[PDB]
PDB file of all heavy atoms in Angstrom:
ATOM      1  N   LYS Y   1    -158.786-128.168-120.063  1.00 43.17           N
ATOM      2  CA  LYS Y   1    -159.924-128.757-120.752  1.00 43.17           C
ATOM      3  C   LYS Y   1    -159.534-129.444-122.058  1.00 43.17           C
ATOM      4  O   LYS Y   1    -160.396-129.807-122.844  1.00 43.17           O
ATOM      5  CB  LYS Y   1    -160.991-127.698-121.044  1.00 43.17           C
ATOM      6  CG  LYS Y   1    -161.354-126.791-119.867  1.00 43.17           C
ATOM      7  CD  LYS Y   1    -162.293-127.437-118.868  1.00 43.17           C
ATOM      8  CE  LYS Y   1    -162.648-126.457-117.753  1.00 43.17           C
ATOM      9  NZ  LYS Y   1    -161.442-125.955-117.002  1.00 43.17           N
ATOM     10  N   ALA Y   2    -158.241-129.598-122.312  1.00 42.36           N
ATOM     11  CA  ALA Y   2    -157.802-130.300-123.527  1.00 42.36           C
ATOM     12  C   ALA Y   2    -157.942-131.787-123.182  1.00 42.36           C
ATOM     13  O   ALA Y   2    -156.960-132.528-123.074  1.00 42.36           O
ATOM     14  CB  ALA Y   2    -156.330-129.956-123.847  1.00 42.36           C
ATOM     15  N   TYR Y   3    -159.179-132.217-123.013  1.00 44.93           N
ATOM     16  CA  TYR Y   3    -159.430-133.574-122.593  1.00 44.93           C
ATOM     17  C   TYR Y   3    -158.922-134.705-123.471  1.00 44.93           C
ATOM     18  O   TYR Y   3    -158.420-135.715-122.970  1.00 44.93           O
ATOM     19  CB  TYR Y   3    -160.914-133.722-122.301  1.00 44.93           C
ATOM     20  CG  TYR Y   3    -161.395-132.789-121.189  1.00 44.93           C
ATOM     21  CD1 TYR Y   3    -162.584-132.070-121.325  1.00 44.93           C
ATOM     22  CD2 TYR Y   3    -160.700-132.685-119.979  1.00 44.93           C
ATOM     23  CE1 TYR Y   3    -163.083-131.279-120.280  1.00 44.93           C
ATOM     24  CE2 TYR Y   3    -161.189-131.891-118.923  1.00 44.93           C
ATOM     25  CZ  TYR Y   3    -162.386-131.197-119.083  1.00 44.93           C
ATOM     26  OH  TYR Y   3    -162.926-130.459-118.049  1.00 44.93           O
ATOM     27  N   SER Y   4    -159.014-134.539-124.776  1.00 49.63           N
ATOM     28  CA  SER Y   4    -158.561-135.589-125.661  1.00 49.63           C
ATOM     29  C   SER Y   4    -157.219-135.280-126.260  1.00 49.63           C
ATOM     30  O   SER Y   4    -156.997-135.563-127.419  1.00 49.63           O
ATOM     31  CB  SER Y   4    -159.565-135.793-126.780  1.00 49.63           C
ATOM     32  OG  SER Y   4    -159.591-134.646-127.582  1.00 49.63           O
ATOM     33  N   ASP Y   5    -156.326-134.713-125.464  1.00 47.36           N
ATOM     34  CA  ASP Y   5    -154.994-134.366-125.912  1.00 47.36           C
ATOM     35  C   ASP Y   5    -154.188-135.622-126.179  1.00 47.36           C
ATOM     36  O   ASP Y   5    -154.395-136.673-125.555  1.00 47.36           O
ATOM     37  CB  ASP Y   5    -154.266-133.523-124.856  1.00 47.36           C
ATOM     38  CG  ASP Y   5    -152.994-132.875-125.394  1.00 47.36           C
ATOM     39  OD1 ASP Y   5    -153.099-131.779-125.994  1.00 47.36           O
ATOM     40  OD2 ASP Y   5    -151.892-133.455-125.224  1.00 47.36           O
ATOM     41  N   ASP Y   6    -153.253-135.504-127.112  1.00 41.70           N
ATOM     42  CA  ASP Y   6    -152.406-136.614-127.467  1.00 41.70           C
ATOM     43  C   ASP Y   6    -151.797-137.287-126.260  1.00 41.70           C
ATOM     44  O   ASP Y   6    -151.693-138.519-126.224  1.00 41.70           O
ATOM     45  CB  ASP Y   6    -151.278-136.141-128.362  1.00 41.70           C
ATOM     46  CG  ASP Y   6    -151.617-136.224-129.821  1.00 41.70           C
ATOM     47  OD1 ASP Y   6    -152.803-136.117-130.197  1.00 41.70           O
ATOM     48  OD2 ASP Y   6    -150.662-136.387-130.601  1.00 41.70           O
ATOM     49  N   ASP Y   7    -151.375-136.478-125.285  1.00 39.89           N
ATOM     50  CA  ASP Y   7    -150.723-136.986-124.068  1.00 39.89           C
ATOM     51  C   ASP Y   7    -151.663-137.705-123.080  1.00 39.89           C
ATOM     52  O   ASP Y   7    -151.232-138.605-122.343  1.00 39.89           O
ATOM     53  CB  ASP Y   7    -149.997-135.841-123.383  1.00 39.89           C
ATOM     54  CG  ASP Y   7    -148.978-135.189-124.296  1.00 39.89           C
ATOM     55  OD1 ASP Y   7    -147.908-135.799-124.495  1.00 39.89           O
ATOM     56  OD2 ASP Y   7    -149.260-134.094-124.837  1.00 39.89           O
ATOM     57  N   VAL Y   8    -152.941-137.314-123.091  1.00 38.28           N
ATOM     58  CA  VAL Y   8    -153.938-137.949-122.242  1.00 38.28           C
ATOM     59  C   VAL Y   8    -154.127-139.318-122.836  1.00 38.28           C
ATOM     60  O   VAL Y   8    -153.874-140.330-122.183  1.00 38.28           O
ATOM     61  CB  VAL Y   8    -155.278-137.217-122.301  1.00 38.28           C
ATOM     62  CG1 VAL Y   8    -156.342-138.031-121.522  1.00 38.28           C
ATOM     63  CG2 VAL Y   8    -155.121-135.806-121.745  1.00 38.28           C
ATOM     64  N   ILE Y   9    -154.567-139.314-124.096  1.00 38.22           N
ATOM     65  CA  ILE Y   9    -154.804-140.504-124.897  1.00 38.22           C
ATOM     66  C   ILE Y   9    -153.630-141.412-124.819  1.00 38.22           C
ATOM     67  O   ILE Y   9    -153.765-142.613-124.660  1.00 38.22           O
ATOM     68  CB  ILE Y   9    -154.963-140.180-126.368  1.00 38.22           C
ATOM     69  CG1 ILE Y   9    -156.244-139.370-126.581  1.00 38.22           C
ATOM     70  CG2 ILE Y   9    -154.993-141.480-127.182  1.00 38.22           C
ATOM     71  CD1 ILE Y   9    -157.503-140.083-126.083  1.00 38.22           C
ATOM     72  N   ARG Y  10    -152.460-140.822-124.921  1.00 38.07           N
ATOM     73  CA  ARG Y  10    -151.232-141.580-124.859  1.00 38.07           C
ATOM     74  C   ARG Y  10    -151.016-142.368-123.586  1.00 38.07           C
ATOM     75  O   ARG Y  10    -150.718-143.582-123.632  1.00 38.07           O
ATOM     76  CB  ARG Y  10    -150.033-140.641-125.055  1.00 38.07           C
ATOM     77  CG  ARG Y  10    -148.681-141.253-124.655  1.00 38.07           C
ATOM     78  CD  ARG Y  10    -147.530-140.464-125.298  1.00 38.07           C
ATOM     79  NE  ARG Y  10    -147.468-139.088-124.822  1.00 38.07           N
ATOM     80  CZ  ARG Y  10    -146.839-138.732-123.713  1.00 38.07           C
ATOM     81  NH1 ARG Y  10    -146.216-139.646-122.980  1.00 38.07           N
ATOM     82  NH2 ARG Y  10    -146.856-137.467-123.337  1.00 38.07           N
ATOM     83  N   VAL Y  11    -151.129-141.678-122.441  1.00 39.19           N
ATOM     84  CA  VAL Y  11    -150.878-142.345-121.176  1.00 39.19           C
ATOM     85  C   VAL Y  11    -151.900-143.475-121.033  1.00 39.19           C
ATOM     86  O   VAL Y  11    -151.541-144.627-120.775  1.00 39.19           O
ATOM     87  CB  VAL Y  11    -150.984-141.311-119.956  1.00 39.19           C
ATOM     88  CG1 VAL Y  11    -150.386-141.895-118.710  1.00 39.19           C
ATOM     89  CG2 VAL Y  11    -150.261-139.998-120.286  1.00 39.19           C
ATOM     90  N   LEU Y  12    -153.167-143.155-121.268  1.00 39.76           N
ATOM     91  CA  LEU Y  12    -154.242-144.147-121.124  1.00 39.76           C
ATOM     92  C   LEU Y  12    -154.251-145.346-122.086  1.00 39.76           C
ATOM     93  O   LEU Y  12    -154.449-146.482-121.634  1.00 39.76           O
ATOM     94  CB  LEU Y  12    -155.582-143.457-121.207  1.00 39.76           C
ATOM     95  CG  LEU Y  12    -155.850-142.358-120.170  1.00 39.76           C
ATOM     96  CD1 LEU Y  12    -157.271-141.810-120.374  1.00 39.76           C
ATOM     97  CD2 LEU Y  12    -155.665-142.923-118.777  1.00 39.76           C
ATOM     98  N   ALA Y  13    -154.032-145.095-123.391  1.00 38.82           N
ATOM     99  CA  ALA Y  13    -154.074-146.168-124.379  1.00 38.82           C
ATOM    100  C   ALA Y  13    -152.776-146.868-124.773  1.00 38.82           C
ATOM    101  O   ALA Y  13    -152.804-147.830-125.505  1.00 38.82           O
ATOM    102  CB  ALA Y  13    -154.785-145.677-125.643  1.00 38.82           C
ATOM    103  N   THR Y  14    -151.664-146.477-124.178  1.00 41.15           N
ATOM    104  CA  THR Y  14    -150.380-146.987-124.587  1.00 41.15           C
ATOM    105  C   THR Y  14    -149.415-147.567-123.488  1.00 41.15           C
ATOM    106  O   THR Y  14    -148.708-148.576-123.703  1.00 41.15           O
ATOM    107  CB  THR Y  14    -149.831-145.751-125.405  1.00 41.15           C
ATOM    108  OG1 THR Y  14    -149.932-145.993-126.818  1.00 41.15           O
ATOM    109  CG2 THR Y  14    -148.555-145.331-124.956  1.00 41.15           C
ATOM    110  N   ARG Y  15    -149.416-146.954-122.299  1.00 38.01           N
ATOM    111  CA  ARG Y  15    -148.528-147.351-121.186  1.00 38.01           C
ATOM    112  C   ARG Y  15    -148.994-148.598-120.405  1.00 38.01           C
ATOM    113  O   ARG Y  15    -150.159-148.864-120.374  1.00 38.01           O
ATOM    114  CB  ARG Y  15    -148.410-146.174-120.227  1.00 38.01           C
ATOM    115  CG  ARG Y  15    -147.889-144.869-120.855  1.00 38.01           C
ATOM    116  CD  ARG Y  15    -146.360-144.690-120.672  1.00 38.01           C
ATOM    117  NE  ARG Y  15    -145.944-143.369-121.141  1.00 38.01           N
ATOM    118  CZ  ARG Y  15    -144.866-143.179-121.870  1.00 38.01           C
ATOM    119  NH1 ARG Y  15    -144.137-144.244-122.198  1.00 38.01           N
ATOM    120  NH2 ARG Y  15    -144.517-141.945-122.249  1.00 38.01           N
ATOM    121  N   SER Y  16    -148.083-149.371-119.819  1.00 37.04           N
ATOM    122  CA  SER Y  16    -148.481-150.541-119.039  1.00 37.04           C
ATOM    123  C   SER Y  16    -149.424-150.098-117.884  1.00 37.04           C
ATOM    124  O   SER Y  16    -149.508-148.911-117.554  1.00 37.04           O
ATOM    125  CB  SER Y  16    -147.265-151.247-118.418  1.00 37.04           C
ATOM    126  OG  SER Y  16    -146.766-150.537-117.280  1.00 37.04           O
ATOM    127  N   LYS Y  17    -150.147-151.067-117.333  1.00 33.50           N
ATOM    128  CA  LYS Y  17    -151.109-150.821-116.261  1.00 33.50           C
ATOM    129  C   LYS Y  17    -150.352-150.454-114.979  1.00 33.50           C
ATOM    130  O   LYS Y  17    -150.706-149.520-114.298  1.00 33.50           O
ATOM    131  CB  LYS Y  17    -152.033-152.068-116.091  1.00 33.50           C
ATOM    132  CG  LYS Y  17    -153.174-152.034-117.180  1.00 33.50           C
ATOM    133  CD  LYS Y  17    -154.181-153.180-117.056  1.00 33.50           C
ATOM    134  CE  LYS Y  17    -155.249-153.046-118.144  1.00 33.50           C
ATOM    135  NZ  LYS Y  17    -155.767-154.420-118.401  1.00 33.50           N
ATOM    136  N   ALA Y  18    -149.269-151.154-114.705  1.00 36.07           N
ATOM    137  CA  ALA Y  18    -148.468-150.830-113.530  1.00 36.07           C
ATOM    138  C   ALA Y  18    -147.943-149.427-113.750  1.00 36.07           C
ATOM    139  O   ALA Y  18    -148.015-148.616-112.849  1.00 36.07           O
ATOM    140  CB  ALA Y  18    -147.349-151.829-113.343  1.00 36.07           C
ATOM    141  N   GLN Y  19    -147.476-149.088-114.955  1.00 39.27           N
ATOM    142  CA  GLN Y  19    -146.989-147.693-115.190  1.00 39.27           C
ATOM    143  C   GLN Y  19    -148.113-146.686-115.036  1.00 39.27           C
ATOM    144  O   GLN Y  19    -147.925-145.550-114.568  1.00 39.27           O
ATOM    145  CB  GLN Y  19    -146.425-147.493-116.625  1.00 39.27           C
ATOM    146  CG  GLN Y  19    -145.872-146.065-116.852  1.00 39.27           C
ATOM    147  CD  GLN Y  19    -144.613-145.736-115.976  1.00 39.27           C
ATOM    148  OE1 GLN Y  19    -144.335-144.575-115.682  1.00 39.27           O
ATOM    149  NE2 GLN Y  19    -143.868-146.747-115.600  1.00 39.27           N
ATOM    150  N   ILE Y  20    -149.297-147.061-115.507  1.00 40.66           N
ATOM    151  CA  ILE Y  20    -150.410-146.157-115.390  1.00 40.66           C
ATOM    152  C   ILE Y  20    -150.827-145.961-113.903  1.00 40.66           C
ATOM    153  O   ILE Y  20    -151.178-144.861-113.451  1.00 40.66           O
ATOM    154  CB  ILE Y  20    -151.606-146.708-116.184  1.00 40.66           C
ATOM    155  CG1 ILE Y  20    -151.210-146.762-117.685  1.00 40.66           C
ATOM    156  CG2 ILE Y  20    -152.882-145.841-115.911  1.00 40.66           C
ATOM    157  CD1 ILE Y  20    -152.325-147.217-118.654  1.00 40.66           C
ATOM    158  N   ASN Y  21    -150.849-147.043-113.157  1.00 42.99           N
ATOM    159  CA  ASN Y  21    -151.268-146.892-111.766  1.00 42.99           C
ATOM    160  C   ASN Y  21    -150.236-145.966-111.075  1.00 42.99           C
ATOM    161  O   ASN Y  21    -150.623-145.005-110.379  1.00 42.99           O
ATOM    162  CB  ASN Y  21    -151.375-148.261-111.141  1.00 42.99           C
ATOM    163  CG  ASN Y  21    -151.920-148.237-109.689  1.00 42.99           C
ATOM    164  OD1 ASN Y  21    -152.928-147.558-109.336  1.00 42.99           O
ATOM    165  ND2 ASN Y  21    -151.246-149.029-108.842  1.00 42.99           N
ATOM    166  N   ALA Y  22    -148.941-146.196-111.342  1.00 43.91           N
ATOM    167  CA  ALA Y  22    -147.910-145.354-110.748  1.00 43.91           C
ATOM    168  C   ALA Y  22    -148.143-143.918-111.144  1.00 43.91           C
ATOM    169  O   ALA Y  22    -148.079-143.009-110.332  1.00 43.91           O
ATOM    170  CB  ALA Y  22    -146.523-145.807-111.171  1.00 43.91           C
ATOM    171  N   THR Y  23    -148.483-143.691-112.392  1.00 43.58           N
ATOM    172  CA  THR Y  23    -148.715-142.325-112.811  1.00 43.58           C
ATOM    173  C   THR Y  23    -149.882-141.734-112.042  1.00 43.58           C
ATOM    174  O   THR Y  23    -149.808-140.590-111.613  1.00 43.58           O
ATOM    175  CB  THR Y  23    -149.047-142.242-114.324  1.00 43.58           C
ATOM    176  OG1 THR Y  23    -148.003-142.878-115.065  1.00 43.58           O
ATOM    177  CG2 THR Y  23    -149.159-140.778-114.795  1.00 43.58           C
ATOM    178  N   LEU Y  24    -150.967-142.495-111.873  1.00 40.54           N
ATOM    179  CA  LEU Y  24    -152.109-141.918-111.197  1.00 40.54           C
ATOM    180  C   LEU Y  24    -151.913-141.747-109.678  1.00 40.54           C
ATOM    181  O   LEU Y  24    -152.487-140.837-109.095  1.00 40.54           O
ATOM    182  CB  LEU Y  24    -153.390-142.682-111.526  1.00 40.54           C
ATOM    183  CG  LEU Y  24    -153.849-142.697-112.997  1.00 40.54           C
ATOM    184  CD1 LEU Y  24    -155.220-143.317-113.042  1.00 40.54           C
ATOM    185  CD2 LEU Y  24    -153.876-141.265-113.634  1.00 40.54           C
ATOM    186  N   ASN Y  25    -151.096-142.591-109.069  1.00 40.96           N
ATOM    187  CA  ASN Y  25    -150.780-142.480-107.637  1.00 40.96           C
ATOM    188  C   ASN Y  25    -150.011-141.197-107.435  1.00 40.96           C
ATOM    189  O   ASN Y  25    -150.137-140.569-106.397  1.00 40.96           O
ATOM    190  CB  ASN Y  25    -149.907-143.627-107.172  1.00 40.96           C
ATOM    191  CG  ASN Y  25    -150.683-144.881-106.952  1.00 40.96           C
ATOM    192  OD1 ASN Y  25    -150.110-145.966-106.924  1.00 40.96           O
ATOM    193  ND2 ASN Y  25    -152.000-144.750-106.782  1.00 40.96           N
ATOM    194  N   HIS Y  26    -149.188-140.823-108.423  1.00 41.58           N
ATOM    195  CA  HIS Y  26    -148.428-139.565-108.350  1.00 41.58           C
ATOM    196  C   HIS Y  26    -149.361-138.401-108.554  1.00 41.58           C
ATOM    197  O   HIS Y  26    -149.166-137.335-107.991  1.00 41.58           O
ATOM    198  CB  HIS Y  26    -147.339-139.497-109.410  1.00 41.58           C
ATOM    199  CG  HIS Y  26    -146.076-140.183-109.012  1.00 41.58           C
ATOM    200  ND1 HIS Y  26    -145.288-139.741-107.974  1.00 41.58           N
ATOM    201  CD2 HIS Y  26    -145.468-141.288-109.504  1.00 41.58           C
ATOM    202  CE1 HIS Y  26    -144.247-140.544-107.841  1.00 41.58           C
ATOM    203  NE2 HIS Y  26    -144.333-141.489-108.758  1.00 41.58           N
ATOM    204  N   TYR Y  27    -150.374-138.600-109.377  1.00 41.61           N
ATOM    205  CA  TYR Y  27    -151.321-137.529-109.607  1.00 41.61           C
ATOM    206  C   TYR Y  27    -151.971-137.096-108.268  1.00 41.61           C
ATOM    207  O   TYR Y  27    -152.098-135.897-107.967  1.00 41.61           O
ATOM    208  CB  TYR Y  27    -152.417-138.002-110.537  1.00 41.61           C
ATOM    209  CG  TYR Y  27    -153.345-136.905-110.961  1.00 41.61           C
ATOM    210  CD1 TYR Y  27    -153.130-136.224-112.178  1.00 41.61           C
ATOM    211  CD2 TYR Y  27    -154.459-136.566-110.192  1.00 41.61           C
ATOM    212  CE1 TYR Y  27    -154.002-135.254-112.621  1.00 41.61           C
ATOM    213  CE2 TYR Y  27    -155.346-135.579-110.620  1.00 41.61           C
ATOM    214  CZ  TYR Y  27    -155.117-134.926-111.845  1.00 41.61           C
ATOM    215  OH  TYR Y  27    -156.001-133.956-112.319  1.00 41.61           O
ATOM    216  N   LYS Y  28    -152.395-138.090-107.487  1.00 40.53           N
ATOM    217  CA  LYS Y  28    -153.054-137.835-106.219  1.00 40.53           C
ATOM    218  C   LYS Y  28    -152.057-137.230-105.234  1.00 40.53           C
ATOM    219  O   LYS Y  28    -152.372-136.268-104.529  1.00 40.53           O
ATOM    220  CB  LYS Y  28    -153.646-139.134-105.667  1.00 40.53           C
ATOM    221  CG  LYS Y  28    -155.003-138.932-104.966  1.00 40.53           C
ATOM    222  CD  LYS Y  28    -155.534-140.223-104.336  1.00 40.53           C
ATOM    223  CE  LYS Y  28    -156.924-140.018-103.735  1.00 40.53           C
ATOM    224  NZ  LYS Y  28    -157.050-138.726-102.998  1.00 40.53           N
ATOM    225  N   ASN Y  29    -150.847-137.777-105.194  1.00 41.14           N
ATOM    226  CA  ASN Y  29    -149.847-137.228-104.304  1.00 41.14           C
ATOM    227  C   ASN Y  29    -149.724-135.762-104.580  1.00 41.14           C
ATOM    228  O   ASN Y  29    -150.074-134.943-103.751  1.00 41.14           O
ATOM    229  CB  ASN Y  29    -148.507-137.900-104.509  1.00 41.14           C
ATOM    230  CG  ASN Y  29    -148.499-139.306-103.996  1.00 41.14           C
ATOM    231  OD1 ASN Y  29    -147.485-140.002-104.042  1.00 41.14           O
ATOM    232  ND2 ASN Y  29    -149.643-139.750-103.503  1.00 41.14           N
ATOM    233  N   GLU Y  30    -149.274-135.448-105.781  1.00 43.72           N
ATOM    234  CA  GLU Y  30    -149.054-134.085-106.230  1.00 43.72           C
ATOM    235  C   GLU Y  30    -150.270-133.176-106.143  1.00 43.72           C
ATOM    236  O   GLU Y  30    -150.125-131.984-105.886  1.00 43.72           O
ATOM    237  CB  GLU Y  30    -148.542-134.110-107.678  1.00 43.72           C
ATOM    238  CG  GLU Y  30    -147.912-132.820-108.182  1.00 43.72           C
ATOM    239  CD  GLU Y  30    -146.623-132.462-107.438  1.00 43.72           C
ATOM    240  OE1 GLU Y  30    -145.907-133.394-106.993  1.00 43.72           O
ATOM    241  OE2 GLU Y  30    -146.324-131.251-107.309  1.00 43.72           O
ATOM    242  N   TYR Y  31    -151.468-133.716-106.358  1.00 44.05           N
ATOM    243  CA  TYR Y  31    -152.674-132.873-106.327  1.00 44.05           C
ATOM    244  C   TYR Y  31    -153.746-133.191-105.279  1.00 44.05           C
ATOM    245  O   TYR Y  31    -154.758-132.501-105.209  1.00 44.05           O
ATOM    246  CB  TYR Y  31    -153.319-132.811-107.727  1.00 44.05           C
ATOM    247  CG  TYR Y  31    -152.331-132.439-108.803  1.00 44.05           C
ATOM    248  CD1 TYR Y  31    -151.658-133.426-109.534  1.00 44.05           C
ATOM    249  CD2 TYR Y  31    -151.976-131.100-109.016  1.00 44.05           C
ATOM    250  CE1 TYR Y  31    -150.644-133.087-110.440  1.00 44.05           C
ATOM    251  CE2 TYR Y  31    -150.967-130.752-109.923  1.00 44.05           C
ATOM    252  CZ  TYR Y  31    -150.305-131.752-110.620  1.00 44.05           C
ATOM    253  OH  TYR Y  31    -149.276-131.417-111.450  1.00 44.05           O
ATOM    254  N   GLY Y  32    -153.540-134.227-104.475  1.00 41.79           N
ATOM    255  CA  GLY Y  32    -154.504-134.533-103.432  1.00 41.79           C
ATOM    256  C   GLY Y  32    -155.664-135.433-103.796  1.00 41.79           C
ATOM    257  O   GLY Y  32    -156.039-136.324-103.026  1.00 41.79           O
ATOM    258  N   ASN Y  33    -156.248-135.206-104.963  1.00 40.25           N
ATOM    259  CA  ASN Y  33    -157.365-136.027-105.398  1.00 40.25           C
ATOM    260  C   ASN Y  33    -156.938-136.922-106.547  1.00 40.25           C
ATOM    261  O   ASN Y  33    -155.920-136.677-107.195  1.00 40.25           O
ATOM    262  CB  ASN Y  33    -158.525-135.141-105.845  1.00 40.25           C
ATOM    263  CG  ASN Y  33    -158.105-134.114-106.872  1.00 40.25           C
ATOM    264  OD1 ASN Y  33    -157.240-133.282-106.609  1.00 40.25           O
ATOM    265  ND2 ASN Y  33    -158.716-134.166-108.052  1.00 40.25           N
ATOM    266  N   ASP Y  34    -157.692-137.987-106.773  1.00 40.35           N
ATOM    267  CA  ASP Y  34    -157.366-138.852-107.883  1.00 40.35           C
ATOM    268  C   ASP Y  34    -157.947-138.174-109.126  1.00 40.35           C
ATOM    269  O   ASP Y  34    -158.953-137.456-109.076  1.00 40.35           O
ATOM    270  CB  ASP Y  34    -157.926-140.265-107.677  1.00 40.35           C
ATOM    271  CG  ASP Y  34    -159.346-140.258-107.210  1.00 40.35           C
ATOM    272  OD1 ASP Y  34    -160.220-139.743-107.940  1.00 40.35           O
ATOM    273  OD2 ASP Y  34    -159.588-140.775-106.104  1.00 40.35           O
ATOM    274  N   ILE Y  35    -157.284-138.400-110.243  1.00 37.44           N
ATOM    275  CA  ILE Y  35    -157.641-137.786-111.511  1.00 37.44           C
ATOM    276  C   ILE Y  35    -159.109-137.658-111.874  1.00 37.44           C
ATOM    277  O   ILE Y  35    -159.498-136.734-112.559  1.00 37.44           O
ATOM    278  CB  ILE Y  35    -156.905-138.526-112.660  1.00 37.44           C
ATOM    279  CG1 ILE Y  35    -157.057-137.744-113.961  1.00 37.44           C
ATOM    280  CG2 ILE Y  35    -157.518-139.910-112.859  1.00 37.44           C
ATOM    281  CD1 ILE Y  35    -156.077-138.178-115.027  1.00 37.44           C
ATOM    282  N   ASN Y  36    -159.922-138.594-111.424  1.00 39.91           N
ATOM    283  CA  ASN Y  36    -161.344-138.623-111.760  1.00 39.91           C
ATOM    284  C   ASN Y  36    -162.197-137.488-111.222  1.00 39.91           C
ATOM    285  O   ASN Y  36    -163.200-137.136-111.820  1.00 39.91           O
ATOM    286  CB  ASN Y  36    -161.914-139.964-111.302  1.00 39.91           C
ATOM    287  CG  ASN Y  36    -160.898-141.105-111.499  1.00 39.91           C
ATOM    288  OD1 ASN Y  36    -160.189-141.542-110.547  1.00 39.91           O
ATOM    289  ND2 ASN Y  36    -160.791-141.569-112.759  1.00 39.91           N
ATOM    290  N   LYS Y  37    -161.800-136.908-110.103  1.00 39.65           N
ATOM    291  CA  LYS Y  37    -162.594-135.821-109.539  1.00 39.65           C
ATOM    292  C   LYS Y  37    -162.416-134.602-110.443  1.00 39.65           C
ATOM    293  O   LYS Y  37    -163.338-133.823-110.643  1.00 39.65           O
ATOM    294  CB  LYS Y  37    -162.129-135.530-108.105  1.00 39.65           C
ATOM    295  CG  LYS Y  37    -162.067-136.771-107.200  1.00 39.65           C
ATOM    296  CD  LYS Y  37    -163.443-137.377-106.918  1.00 39.65           C
ATOM    297  CE  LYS Y  37    -163.336-138.485-105.872  1.00 39.65           C
ATOM    298  NZ  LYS Y  37    -164.667-138.982-105.399  1.00 39.65           N
TER     299      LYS Y  37
END
């Protein structure tokens, strides 16, 4: 529940979009659902 953690904010407000999409595609792989659920 550390929703506004430095690392959350960081990935979202600082990394390229292609890097971000790659990060989120891994999120779903590793966890099944996309981060939003």
